[PDB]
Amino acid sequence: YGDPDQTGRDLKGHNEVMVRAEAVLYVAIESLDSFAVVKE
Amino acid sequence: YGDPDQTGRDLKGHNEVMVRAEAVLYVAIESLDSFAVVKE
């Protein structure tokens, strides 16, 4: 039901069905003097 | 689900729940000369 990803189309109006992948996480970086990268 | 507040914003496109409380009541008054009011 409803209208997720609000564009203006009901799921029961167009008979469409939504598929969801919710996940809340966190990313912390203690220091940056310890990582080296390789750029072109 | 849906958009109960009818402000466009749906409840699965903004990740928000709705808490609602509905009731049906009536108020009838047989008279008015049987009530006094203390006014400032």
Interface of A with B in 1-40 (CB under 8 A): 1-6, 18, 22
> Nearest CA to A4 among A12, B26, B30?
A12
Can you give the resolution of this entry in Å?
A: 3.7
CA distance A5 to A23: 16
What is the Cα Rg of chain A in Å?
21
CA distance B21 to B4: 12
CA distance B29 to B34: 10
Nearest residue in A to B1, CA atom? A2
Query: C-alpha distances in angstroms, B15 versus A23, A29, A39, B29?
Result: 12, 28, 39, 45
CA distance B12 to B18: 11
| Amino acid type, B26 | Y
8 A C-beta contact, residue B2 and residue B11: yes
Please, is B2 exposed, middle or buried when counting C-beta atoms within 10 Å of its C-beta (0-12, 13-18, 19+)?
Answer: middle
Q: Please, which experimental method was used?
A: cryo-EM
